[PDB]
Amino acid sequence: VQLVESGGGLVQPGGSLRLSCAASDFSFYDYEMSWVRQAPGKALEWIGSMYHSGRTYINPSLKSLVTISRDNSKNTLYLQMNSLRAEDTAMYYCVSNWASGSTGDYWGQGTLVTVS
């Protein structure tokens, strides 16, 4: 498959989870990677944006909370979330080229973020 995602299930607040987003080749990595959320009723909120030029620009109140790591063997992205909240409880997607609309992107299988 050209673009896929991995990792997820149940996320423990405070801890670190090594999420993944695999693919088939680096030539399909134009121009962006992003791990976003689409909450019911909430407007567009993007939690991550990995760029083709090796840049990660995030909301200033989020980039400190997010670790960034990019791979090229499996072309996977490593991102860690801590102190989780219920506002992220959605079908958590790994959307490559999120800003490129809903035709030049892949929507992953999805997971959930729940706080006990």
Added chain:
Amino acid sequence: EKGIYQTSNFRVQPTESIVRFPNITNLCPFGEVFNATRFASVYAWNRKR
């Protein structure tokens, strides 16, 4: 003088005009652009030909 002379001619003037164009079936896909849902990035505005 005595005889027959031709003066002019007469024509039945036409009634209201009629325009007949074929059935309109094909249309531009304007519903999916103006009534769309989410947009692209600002620095990547699309050119939907």
